[PDB]
């Protein structure tokens, strides 16, 4: 499986040293139910699954992770047992069975070929079945904080994303973990001196160092490999010292010698609407509490707004014609925007129509050159924003709350974070995003095309 995982370029450059270390984590540094003695082997297998992909899936693209669940479970859940695919797979491959999404575990249980692909591939009228397996495929340490909280010898290979500041998350983790937030923005002699002495001090001190722009001063790697071993020992030197490697955006080729020794994890700035929403509320605390309290609610609206945008941003071209990185700085900005209109928002005097106009052309009206996209954000404003509490406007995500005299932290859950992921299962819902479902329907097949190809790719050894 590892060998097939390693066909994913340098993303999966994890090798045999790590493989053995991975299994050492399986049998030692994971669960107490992985005792090698039989008959724990059934559970071991289930926990091999978990430990193996909790590192190996973090070294692979989500499209791999989706098919990893599908492929790998033949070994781990069914001890090498085949099963047959329906809907999308027939559409793009064949496999002699078709029945769509409306069908669950009904006529699925056939001989030789088991009910789970017969069930879940139905679901693949839109490719979501690869997550619907619910077959223990979840990264054990999926939380980047948990990635950090591992054995330090497995250094923090932060494989990030283009336009996404994964380093920022690490900065926040330094502060969250309360470790000496040191940052080395590699590129100068002074930064080489930081690579030299700043790290050397940290080796003793127990410092937390972000090797920002690890590729810009890549040549360090020439001796770094012995320094890898050295730093591993330095982690133990203070049981605090941690080293983070960051810069990787897209085509950043990382060395197998280190992927073989480090914790290879790809950063993913991919939150659903409510995921985005809830996190954004937590980040503001009291920005709209400052008199007038009507702006508290406005800050809550902005979290919903940005979140709808993060969905739309991902939907591009379905969403926006241009994929501008609308981020939580724009969200933060909007709360600052509110912070300023508190002069009017002391009560319902806030010119929320003016604010809507500004949400479209100030807050999220950034890189967008296309007037359509400016109109897209504007029609979202029309759809969502209003300068007060009790807004009976978008009940689809359930924004109609009376969250007035209480802040973004003070009573977040009370009326808003108590809500579940209020996202239409059959849509985006694109009426919130004011988008054409047609693209989703096209995505059904476009997904099937890529997925079909990737399952043929990986499945050979899984």
């Amino acid at each position: 499986m590892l060998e097939k995982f390693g066909q994913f370029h340098w993303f999966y450059g994890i090798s045999i040293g790590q493989f053995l270390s991975c299994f050492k984590r399986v049998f030692i540094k994971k669960s107490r139910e992985t005792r090698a003695a039989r008959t724990r082997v059934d559970e071991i297998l289930w926990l091999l699954y978990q430990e193996v992909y909790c590192q190996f899936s973090t070294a692979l693209d989500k499209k791999f992770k989706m098919i990893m669940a599908m492929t790998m479970f033949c070994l781990y859940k069914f001890d090498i047992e085949s099963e047959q695919y329906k809907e999308a797979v027939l559409t793009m491959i064949g496999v002699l069975s078709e029945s769509s999404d409306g069908v669950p575990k009904l006529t699925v249980d056939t001989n030789d070929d088991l009910r789970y692909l017969w069930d879940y591939v139905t679901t693949k009228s839109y490719i979501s079945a690869l997550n619907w397996f619910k077959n223990e495929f979840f990264v054990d340490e999926w939380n980047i904080a948990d990635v950090v909280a591992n054995s330090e010898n497995n250094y923090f290979t932060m494989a990030s994303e283009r336009d996404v500041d994964g380093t920022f998350k690490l900065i926040e983790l330094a502060k969250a973990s309360k470790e000496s937030l040191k940052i080395i923005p590699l590129g100068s002699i002074e930064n080489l001196n930081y690579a030299q002495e700043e790290i050397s001090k940290s080796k003793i001190e127990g410092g937390w160092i972000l090797l920002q722009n690890i590729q810009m001063s890549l040549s360090w790697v020439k001796t770094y490999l012995h320094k890898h071993v050295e730093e591993t020992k330095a982690a133990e030197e203070h049981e605090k010292f941690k080293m983070f490697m960051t810069c990787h955006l897209t085509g950043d080729k990382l060395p197998a010698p280190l992927l073989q020794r480090t914790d290879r994890v790809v950063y993913e700035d991919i939150p659903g609407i409510l995921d985005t929403v809830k996190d954004l509320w937590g980040s503001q605390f009291f920005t709209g509490k400052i008199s007038g309290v009507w702006s508290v609610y406005c800050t809550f609206l902005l979290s919903w707004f940005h979140a709808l945008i993060t969905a739309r941003t991902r939907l591009v071209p379905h969403g926006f014609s241009k994929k501008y990185y609308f981020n939580d700085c724009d969200f933060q900005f909007a709360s600052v925007y509110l912070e300023n209109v508190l002069a009017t928002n002391s009560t319902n005097n806030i010119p929320w129509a003016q604010v809507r106009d500004h949400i479209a052309t100030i807050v999220y009206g950034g890189k967008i050159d296309e007037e359509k996209d400016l109109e897209v954000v504007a029609k979202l404003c029309a759809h969502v924003f209003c300068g007060s509490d009790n807004l009976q406007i978008v009940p689809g995500v359930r924004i109609p709350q009376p969250l007035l005299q209480q802040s973004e932290e003070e009573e977040r859950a009370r009326l808003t974070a108590i809500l579940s992921n209020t996202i239409e299962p059959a849509d985006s819902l694109s009426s919130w995003l004011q988008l054409p479902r047609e693209s989703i329907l096209d995505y059904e097949r476009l997904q099937a095309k890529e997925v079909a190809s990737s399952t043929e790719q990986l499945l050979q050894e899984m």
């Binding site: 940052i183 920002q212 810009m216 810069c247 700085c329 724009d330 900005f333 009017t344 003016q354 009206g365």
Partner: protein, 1122 residues
């Protein structure tokens, strides 16, 4: 050391001639003094390193004083490092600058030499010897000081500077206190103007009008109020007749604000206004002012949405002002709250559509003098670290112009420094160790980046930075209001009428003109058009004629040369008077005359495009010539500059630097990490000089800096701020270098397809083509050169007696036909008339040159008949010897075109039938030297036996040799390439030869290093040299691999660009100095294999306009059998 003495000429030298220096080391300076009587006094002329060494008695007057220098430097270095610390302003300059500032500190004038970096937006100073009473804003308008200040060094330049600012500030707001009171009460603006500076007069007018609009926001008087400001417009429009250009401009800006009031009030007037909460005044900004403040830079509040910002009042005056479009407006609110987040921005859109203008608009709205950073330079972060201390000690607002075009080295290194600064901005941490000491970080600084639509929208900015930047999609601003309000404030009679017709004029043009990539007419251009309107009214600008005249002046010029009719016809469809001929008709006429003197036809298409040069000479800050070298791209510049100077009545201050043989570090400076400064390069030192002594002589002279290449952003992007509109270069240490109105940029190309329109479309372009010269036009040029042909031994009497058959051939269409027949056949180099007219006339005239001696005794007519074959040989060598014998033969069939003897029927053709010195001929039959190998060296390749094609090349070469030009031997090793080479470099002891190796990666320096052994230099008093290896004998340098040396990023053969200035210009830009140094008699020739072979190097079109070449592939079995 001496190097320190040079840098320390100020402190050590100038502080002994004027010894006001810190006694700490002055006591050591006293020992210097005893000797500085020689090396500082004689150094009034003898200033540089070795030059100081050439000062009498330097043996101790330099060296002993160097020992004292060391004694001194031990604390002096740190003295000025601390003086530099004391003055944030000293971080905008180098230590040499500072060494001289303190060096002759008594001279308060020396201090004022750095005002562009020491002060804000201030023009000049109102002062007396060592005492000051007032100050001149960058506008030219003045503000006196609240109190007289003494300037002489005494009081301590730091204190002194602080005092200067204090009294200016006091005047800035104290007189402003009065200004508001006056306007708010209703005092006529003439009085208000008489008593104060406009940048804030307007601001207090806005405070008054804010109160007055609040009255109408309460629905007390929307119509009346609208009428009131409209009546105030009418009053000011009458007041525009005041002769003071600054004052009428002053109130034009006020009028624009009144027009904003007619717009905004008009909207409020025409809308159910929810008091100030209605976006028509909640979105639209408002102003407040507190006269009751002791801080004379902090009284006015800038407001909209729900925030008030503190206006700075940095002394500026009138200068810039943008129309308050809704897009500018949301730009301001975005910038504001981004500022409140302490986050930056990233503008994405072209200059002329607000790329920088809207940043500056906000800065002006804030009252700050924004430091615009032309980021395309060698901004080593160490140098910036110095600057960072200065700008953070102050709080300078940063505008980063083309930020992502700066090298990553710096970006990552600075991200360390600026992040600490950013952290301090967030925290409230003033003092931050910057450069080498705790620097009091001022919260006024902010980082807003701006680029013309970045290359394909690419995220060159690292995500660890980018996260905190909010983009500003400057696709466009509300140009409908920009254009109309500009025409309205202009007093343009058709500000609405013509404006609507302009929409339709450009509409028609867009539906008819071609989509030339070398063409643009957006708001950027429109701003140029808007600038043209009023003055074109005076230049025969009939109501609508005004803009179509402008549409003749700009936009069309750049468009393909066949679309002239598009503009004449489409503009006529709306308004019959579709522009006017170059009003300064005498200029395009003098141009024509210059071209006639140059031997070119000066076609009307050419002259018309040049009328557009003259039209845009006035209008555009930069122009791109597109076309043929010698017929457009270059002939335009060649001859329009002569009449250019006349067009404006200015000096023809034009420059041509071969930038592609100098590095960007050679040009803009290299890093000096030991000092944390960087060595100024050619262009950097020049541009610093532009702003400290060059424009002191060329303040109004017409300056055009010429770009000698196809677009290649590495030597183009640095100029973009000029092309944009900004017109500025800010250096690595904050040395802002503004580019003046008399400084324009002239590009020479035919192909800008090397980058994005983001930069191309920022400036004007004048399109030519090869249609500028027919072969007749090219011949008229050749003809004049044939009149002057060639060797001085030729009395030109013999020439006329022979050449007139050629002269007659020039008239013959059949000669034109052989130029097209050559084009129809395969040749090793591209057939170009600027090369072939030269090759043919050089071969022919040198054949004539040999006849100058022979012909003296030979019969005139008989020779006229003999040279019909001979001249045909030069025609059948120039346009045929450069290829395969069969292609040559096919070209030889064209032998029936020569005037003297039009016969295809010639047997052994003239290329074979060689003319002799006694009118006889010699048919070039096999000349393979049967009597050669008899014994001894039979198998030795060093003396290898030739063929008639290897011999032919030498026979042709002899006249190419007589011309002493660039002759290329083309053929593979052993074919004749090396066979001929062995013989060719041994042709005569008369010439010096050098078998130079040119591999793919052999530089001209590797070669030059060797050539320094093989060449000499007669250094002159001008710093110029000249001399071949031996005296007189031409240094026949031999390039053994002409088509092997690599091309650069865009296919430019930079090796040859150097070789051309070396040989064609007889000199070179000595890179270490960037010093042009001359050459005497060096002759560059060479060899190469067939360029048709895989992996061979292409020759530039303009190199094909000047290089000769001969061709032979591997030899025949017949000749090998012999």
């Amino acid at each position: 050391v001496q190097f320190y003495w040079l840098d320390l000429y100020g402190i050590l030298g100038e502080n002994l001639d004027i010894q006001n220096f810190l006694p700490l080391e002055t006591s050591k300076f006293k020992s210097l003094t005893s000797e500085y009587k020689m090396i500082t006094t004689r150094a009034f002329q003898l200033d540089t390193t070795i030059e100081v060494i050439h000062i009498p008695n330097f043996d101790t007057t330099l060296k002993l004083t160097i020992d004292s220098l060391k004694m001194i430097k031990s604390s002096l270095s740190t003295f000025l490092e601390r003086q530099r610390r004391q003055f944030p302003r000293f971080y905008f300059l180098g230590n040499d600058d500072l060494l001289k500032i303190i060096g002759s500190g008594k001279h308060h004038d020396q201090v004022s030499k750095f005002m562009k970096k020491m002060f804000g937006s201030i023009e000049s100073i109102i002062f007396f010897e060592d005492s000051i009473t007032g100050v001149r804003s960058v506008e030219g308008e003045v503000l006196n000081l609240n109190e007289k200040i003494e300037l002489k060094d005494s009081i301590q330049a730091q204190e002194w500077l602080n005092i200067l600012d204090t009294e200016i500030k006091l005047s800035v707001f104290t007189q402003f206190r009065d200004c508001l009171g006056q306007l708010k009460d209703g005092t006529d603006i003439e009085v208000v103007v008489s008593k104060y500076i406009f940048q804030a007069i307007l601001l207090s007018a806005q405070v008054m009008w804010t109160e007055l609009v609040e009255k109408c926001l309460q629905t007390n008087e929307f119509s009346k109020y609208w009428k009131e400001v409209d009546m105030k417009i009418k009053g000011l429009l009458d007041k525009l007749n005041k002769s003071s250009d600054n004052v009428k401009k002053k109130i034009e800006a006020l009028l624009v604000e009144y027009l904003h009031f007619n717009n905004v009030i008009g909207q409020l007037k025409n809308c159910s206004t929810k008091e100030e909460a209605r976006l028509l005044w909640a979105k639209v900004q408002k102003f407040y002012q507190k006269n009751d403040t002791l801080d004379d830079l902090n009284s006015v509040f800038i407001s909209q949405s729900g925030y008030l910002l503190q206006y700075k009042f940095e002394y500026i005056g009138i200068p810039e002002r943008l129309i308050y479009t809704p897009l500018l407006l949301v730009g301001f609110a975005t910038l504001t709250d981004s500022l409140h987040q302490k986050y930056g921005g990233c503008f994405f859109g072209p200059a002329g559509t607000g790329k920088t203008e809207t940043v500056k608009a906000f800065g002006q709205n804030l009252g700050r003098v924004v430091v615009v950073f032309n980021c395309d330079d060698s901004f080593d972060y160490q140098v910036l670290s110095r600057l960072l201390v200065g700008i953070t000690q102050i709080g300078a607002w940063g505008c980063f112009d083309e930020f992502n075009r700066l090298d990553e080295k710096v970006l990552s290194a600075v991200s360390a420094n600026i992040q600490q600064i950013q952290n301090g901005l967030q925290v409230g941490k003033s003092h931050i160790t910057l450069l080498e000491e705790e620097t009091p970080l001022s919260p006024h600084t902010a980082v807003f980046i701006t680029l013309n639509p970045g290359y394909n929208g690419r995220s060159e900015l690292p995500e660890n930075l980018k996260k905190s930047f909010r983009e500003f999609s400057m696709k466009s601003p509300q140009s409908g209001t920009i254009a109309e309000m500009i025409l309205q404030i202009m007093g343009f009679e058709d500000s609405k009428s013509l404006a609507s017709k302009i929409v339709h004029f450009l509409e028609l043009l867009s539906s008819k003109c071609s989509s030339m990539n070398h063409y643009h007419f957006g708001l950027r251009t429109l701003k140029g058009v808007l600038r043209n309107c009023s003055p074109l009214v005076s230049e025969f600008g009939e109501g609508e004629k005004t803009v179509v005249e402008s549409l003749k002046r700009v936009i069309l010029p750049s468009l393909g040369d066949t679309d002239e009719l598009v503009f004449k016809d489409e503009l006529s469809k709306i308004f019959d008077s579709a522009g006017t001929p170059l009003n300064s008709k005498a200029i395009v006429q003098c141009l024509k005359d210059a071209g006639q003197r140059s031997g070119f036809s000066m076609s009307e298409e050419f002259l018309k495009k040049c009328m557009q040069f003259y039209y845009m000479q006035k209008t555009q800050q930069a122009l791109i010539l597109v076309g043929k070298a010698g017929c457009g791209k270059t002939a335009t510049w060649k001859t329009v500059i002569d009449a250019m100077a006349i067009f404006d009545g200015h000096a023809n201050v034009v420059y041509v630097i071969d930038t592609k043989v100098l590095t960007k570090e050679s040009l803009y400076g290299s890093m000096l990490k030991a000092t944390l400064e960087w060595r100024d390069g050619l262009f950097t030192s020049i541009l610093r000089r532009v702003n400290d002594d060059i424009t002191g002589t060329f303040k109004n002279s017409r300056i055009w800096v010429v770009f000698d290449s196809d677009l290649d952003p590495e030597y183009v992007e640095a100029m973009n701020s000029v092309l944009d509109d900004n017109k500025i270069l800010t250096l690595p240490n904050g040395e802002r270098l503004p580019i003046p109105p008399n400084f324009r940029i002239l590009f020479e190309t035919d192909n800008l397809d090397h980058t994005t329109p983001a930069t191309i479309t920022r400036c004007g372009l004048l399109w030519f083509s090869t249609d500028v010269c027919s072969i007749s036009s090219k011949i008229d040029h050749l003809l004049n050169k044939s009149y002057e042909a060639l060797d001085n031994k030729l009395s030109m009497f013999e020439l006329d007696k022979l050449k007139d058959l050629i002269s007659d051939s020039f008239d013959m269409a059949s000669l034109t036909n052989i130029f097209t027949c050559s084009n129809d056949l395969v040749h090793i180099l591209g057939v170009r008339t600027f090369n072939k007219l030269e090759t043919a006339v050089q071969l022919a005239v040198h054949l004539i040159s040999s006849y100058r001696q022979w012909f003296q005794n030979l019969d005139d007519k008989s020779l006229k008949d003999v040279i019909t074959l001979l001249i045909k040989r030069s025609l059948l060598y120039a346009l045929a010897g450069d290829s395969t014998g069969e292609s040559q033969r096919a070209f030889i069939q064209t032998i029936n075109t020569y005037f003297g003897h039009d016969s295809q029927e010639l047997s052994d053709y003239s290329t074979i039938v060689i003319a002799n010195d006694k009118l006889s001929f010699s048919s070039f039959c096999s000349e393979i030297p049967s009597v050669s190998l008899e014994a001894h060296e039979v198998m030795r390749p060093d003396i290898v036996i030739p063929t008639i094609d290897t011999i032919k090349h030498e026979k042709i070469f002899y006249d190419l040799l007589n011309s002493k030009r660039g002759i290329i031997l083309c053929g593979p090793p052993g074919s004749g390439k090396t066979m001929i080479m062995n013989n060719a470099l041994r042709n005569s002891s008369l010439y010096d030869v050098v078998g130079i190796n040119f591999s793919k990666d052999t530089t001209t320096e590797h070669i030059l290093s060797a050539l320094h052994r093989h060449t000499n230099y007669v250094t002159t008093s001008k710093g110029l040299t000249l001399l071949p290896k031996s005296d007189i004998k031409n240094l026949v340098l031999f390039c053994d691999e002409i088509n092997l040396p690599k091309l650069d990023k865009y296919g430019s053969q930079n090796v040859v660009l150097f070789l051309r200035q070396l040989m064609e210009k007889q000199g070179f830009w000595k890179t270490p100095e960037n010093k042009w140094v001359t050459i005497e008699r060096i002759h560059i020739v060479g060899a190469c294999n067939p360029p048709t072979d895989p992996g061979r190097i292409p020759m530039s079109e303009r190199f094909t306009r000047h290089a000769a070449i001969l061709y032979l592939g591997y030899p025949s079995g017949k000749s090998l059998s012999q």
